[PDB]
Amino acid sequence: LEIIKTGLAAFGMSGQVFHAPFISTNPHFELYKIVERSKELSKERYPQASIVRSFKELTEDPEIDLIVVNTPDNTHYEYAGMALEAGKNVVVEKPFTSTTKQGEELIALAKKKGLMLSVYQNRRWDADFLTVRDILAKSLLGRLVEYESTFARYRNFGLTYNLGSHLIDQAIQLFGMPEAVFADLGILREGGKVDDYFIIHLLHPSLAPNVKITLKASYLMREAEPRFALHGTLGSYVKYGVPNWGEESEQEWGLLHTEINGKEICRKYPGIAGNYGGFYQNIYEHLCLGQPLETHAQDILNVIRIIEAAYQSHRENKIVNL
């Protein structure tokens, strides 16, 4: 009900694309202060923001309700820590912290002080994932029985950490944490030193324990597997991959093949647009209206636990129970 005065820690790509346009347009937030080291780039589009020269200046201002930590990766633990100690709610960009221990510390500190600690991941707000969420919300496939998600690439010259994070994040958000993890990893390309292939099964996710989950990525898929393939009792949705913050061109549309009002339909499906402002609207609804936050920092720790369970599964040739 009171406007969330927001300090933005950096005005590089991420500040200009992921953060400032939505803090600005959202009427429940004020783009109040922006850190720029020497430049005044933000003046042109955001003339009512005040430019400060240092991060500490955001933490020392009692008017600030929220600090967005989108500075370089190495600064994240220190900066989020400074902001929380100063009594500010915090958004940190992925990667949240350099260690799990650090992440646990910050969550505990936020809990102690009654503050929000959110982790920003732009892919949560992309057209493709939101379209999948919407298909599920509307039960277009009937009762869902299978979910598959693959990052297909073709490149010669670790994947489970780099692309697995996004896939695991999205699966946990839709279906909850699994009882167990199977993973098989590969180094498929000659001369490779880190995994360039994985397949992961999340066994019995808490919200939908009967749904079969497959997460995959590979650098040797010259013909791509689907970015999403979903199967239900009434139908299927299959989507192939190419920020993704608007609508999608026809070439990118998924195929929806299902039963609607008792009639079989099989058509390319435009889906719904990306909604990068959704991140901030959810923060508003959480802080002001007490609604569930979709981006709690504990999510990231949960993804890391799954990533580690996947590497353990492969290394030990075992199903890892959680």
Binding site for a copy of itself (CB under 8 A): 145-146, 156, 180, 182, 184, 186, 188-190, 197, 199, 201, 203, 210, 212, 214, 218, 220-223, 225, 229, 231-238, 255, 257-258, 266, 317-319, 321
Shortest CB 230 distance to a copy of itself, Å: 9
Shortest Å distance, C-beta 246 to a copy of itself: 25
Q: Residues 6 or more apart from 90 whose CB is under 8 A from it? A: 66, 67, 68, 69, 80, 83, 84, 110, 115, 116, 117, 118
Q: Which is nearer to a copy of itself, 198 or 280 (CB)?
A: 198
Alpha-carbon span 11 to 321, nearest angstrom? 43
Contacts of 17 (CB under 8 A, 6+ apart): 243
The smaller minimum CB distance to a copy of itself, of residues 8 and 202, is found at 202
Instruction: Confirm if 153 and 273 have CB atoms less than 8 A apart.
Output: no
| In 60-157, alpha helices (H) | 76-85, 100-112, 127-137
- Minimum CB distance to a copy of itself, residue 304 (Å): 23
Tokens of 2: 């009171």
Residue 280's contacts (CB-CB under 8 Å, 6 or more residues apart) are: 22, 23, 26, 29
CB of 254 to a copy of itself, least distance (A): 10
Instruction: Considering the complex, state which of residue 36 and residue 225 has its C-beta at the smaller distance from a copy of itself.
Output: 225
CB of 184 to a copy of itself, least distance (A): 6
Q: Which is nearer to a copy of itself, 108 or 266 (CB)?
A: 266
- Give 86 or 229: the residue with its C-beta nearer to a copy of itself: 229
Residue 301 or 319: which CB sits closer to a copy of itself?
319
Q: Using DSSP, how many helices (H) and how many strands (E) does the chain show?
A: 10, 15
Taking each helix axis from N to C terminus, what angle separates 127-137 and 164-175, rounded to the nearest 10 degrees? 20
Q: Are strands 117-120 and 66-69 parallel, antiparallel or unpaired?
A: unpaired
- Taking the complex as a whole, the smallest distance from the CB of residue 138 to a copy of itself amounts, in Å, to 16
